[PDB]
């Protein structure tokens, strides 16, 4: 599923991401836009042979099991395919564990490079939340 921008904003808000660990909603929409262009089916392979899944491009090196990343962890306790659902719940629950792990949203390279320090409130302007 390819979310619209306000549609995603509303789903994230319902799932408790607004101001989660101090990150306003616009941060999460911004990160999703640049990580996956709001497509829950996005996958991308990393150089080490891990893969990133879903609308927040969660990495199989640490966070989910895809059966093909030897020696990786599964800290979200989920198959990586669950991260590709049209239902964003599994991605949101796992993102919450990632952003809690000490490094905040710097775990998302696109967020660091394209959202951090910008006016992220522009990402939810005009949306009915």
The secondary structure of 16-52 as a DSSP string is: T-TTBTTB-HHHHHHHHHHHHTTBTT-EEE-TTS-EE
Residue 91 touches Na ion, criterion: CB under 5 A: no
Q: Interhelix angle for 5-14 vs 25-36, to 10°?
A: 130
Q: In this complex, which beta carbon is closest to Cl ion, that of residue 2 or of residue 110?
A: 110
Burial (Cβ within 10 Å: 0-12, 13-18, ≥19) of residue 18: middle
Among 37, 103, 118, 121, which residue sits at the site for Cl ion (rule: CB under 5 A)?
A: 121
Residue 6 touches Cl ion, criterion: CB under 5 A: no
Can you name the residues that pair with 52 across neighbouring β-strands?
A: 44, 59
Site string for Na ion, 7-46 (x = CB under 5 A): ----------------------------------------
Total residues interacting with Na ion, rule: CB under 5 A: 5
Name which of residues 52 to 71 contact Na ion (CB under 5 A).
60, 65, 69
Q: Is 119 marked as a binding-site residue?
A: no
């Amino acid at each position: 599923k390819v979310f619209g921008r306000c549609e995603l904003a509303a789903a994230m808000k319902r799932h408790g991401l607004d101001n989660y660990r101090g990150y306003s909603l616009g941060n999460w929409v911004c990160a999703a836009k640049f990580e996956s262009n709001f497509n829950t089916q996005a996958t991308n392979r990393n150089t080490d042979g891990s893969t990133d899944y879903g609308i927040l491009q969660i990495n199989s090196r640490w966070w989910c099991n895809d059966g093909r990343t030897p020696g990786s962890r599964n800290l979200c306790n989920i198959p990586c395919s669950a991260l590709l659902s049209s239902d964003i719940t599994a991605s949101v629950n796992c993102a919450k564990k990632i952003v809690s792990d000490g490094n905040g949203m710097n775990a998302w390279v696109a967020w660091r490079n394209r959202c951090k320090g910008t006016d992220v409130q522009a990402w939810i302007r005009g949306c009915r939340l």
